């Protein structure tokens, strides 16, 4: 009854658009456990994530807290939301994430794209149907867990079936609280990712003891935020954190955006003659490399633009705030959402039309309409890492094939956690 006075109604994201155009740039939704209101004009975006002031709605973030009653991403980057414990750890674990830090990981990205690509090279028949989803999903976590944490999970090879499926059955659990046996699955693949971290850490203690060769990457720092603490807890929360949130999106923009491209041929001819031009017959991808791939990077950000993986955030509102003239009761789940913002007409001429350009030197930036990493003190800690390896494994692909989609395969969304492609992204492939 407190919010009845909000505008508000009588994939989840494409009603919220729908409302958000039909009933302004606040509105009541009463989809999740509690009301939250969805917040959509740019305004709104400055003044709530660019302070920090505002500070993320634990009460929305329980459900990647604990999953059916086992601890899955518990008091981690992510999810915990008091200011001070989420700054210690930002603080420590930001120094993997330096120029420096980042520049050393462009081997790991260069190894396994090479493997993805040689991979797909053998089957460019033009015949044979390839999941791209699942092609990319094996590449991302092999990247992330060398790079992070100095293990080699080989799945571009098939190995680790468990593992994918535990990922796949903990993301589809997340959702499903947000019978008998599907708790089971869920549950048990909780814990058996909690058990990886355990092994990991044991063997990287291990290694460091009879001090053995061991390079300091993001499994480093999240071992430095626990220094003497009472037990493993809060560094397992960090391991898992990373585990997932260093593959599964990266995964899904890469899927979203050669499915895309595939509709996209005049778009796809520019970025292999800007791929041909800057790297060449080069088999290896340097840091100086990437900044040049220009064209590249505009077509991602459009691709996040209209395919945003994680669609927005949460920020708790205390007290009773006036919100473009709209009354909004204290101890409210604020809701943002790029996805929603970037298909609204009013915030980007043509919406639906897949326009680099918007991107290019020279265009006007988005002002707080366009935020797929987020904004703020709470923005992705991950974003240059993902926009480097998402760009090498782009890059490498360009030089190499050329992707149709199998007829059939659909352009259409689902949502499991994150958003990603309804479709595995079936592909024929062709040497270029
Ligand atoms: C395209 C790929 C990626 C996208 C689109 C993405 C998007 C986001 C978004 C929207 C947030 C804010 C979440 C919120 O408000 O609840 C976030 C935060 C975060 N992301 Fe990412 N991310 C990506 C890749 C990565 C990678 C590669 C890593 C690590 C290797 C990572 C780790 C994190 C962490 C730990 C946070 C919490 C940061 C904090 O609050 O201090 N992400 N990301
Ligand atoms: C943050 C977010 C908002 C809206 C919808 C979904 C998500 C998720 N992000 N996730 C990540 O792993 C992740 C988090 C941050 N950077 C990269 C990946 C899931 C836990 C899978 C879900």
Known sequence: SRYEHIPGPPVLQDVFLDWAKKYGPVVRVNVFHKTSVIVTSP??????????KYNKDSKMYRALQTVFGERLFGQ??????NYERWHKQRRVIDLAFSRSSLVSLM????????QLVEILEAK???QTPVSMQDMLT?????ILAKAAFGMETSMLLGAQKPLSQAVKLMLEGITASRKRKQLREVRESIRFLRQVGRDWVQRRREALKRGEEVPADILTQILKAEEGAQDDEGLLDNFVTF??????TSANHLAFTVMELSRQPEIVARLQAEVDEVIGSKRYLDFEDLGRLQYLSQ???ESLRLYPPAWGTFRLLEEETLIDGVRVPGNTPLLFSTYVMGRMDTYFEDPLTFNPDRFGPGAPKPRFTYFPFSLGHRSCIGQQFAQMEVKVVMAKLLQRLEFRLVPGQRFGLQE?????PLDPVLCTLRPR
Do not use: P, R, W
Not at 43 to 52: A, N
Not at 76 to 81: D, F
């Open 43 to 52: 305004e709104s975006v400055k003044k709530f994530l660019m302070s920090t």
């Open 138 to 142: 094996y590449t991302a976590m092999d």
């Open 243 to 248: 585990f997932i949130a260093g593959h599964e």
């Open 299 to 301: 077509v991602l950000k």
């Open 107 to 114: 081997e790991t990205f260069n190894e396994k794209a090479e």
């Open 124 to 126: 460019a028949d033009g």
């Open 76 to 81: 981690g980057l992510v999810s915990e939301c």
């Open 416 to 420: 499991q956690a994150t958003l990603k």
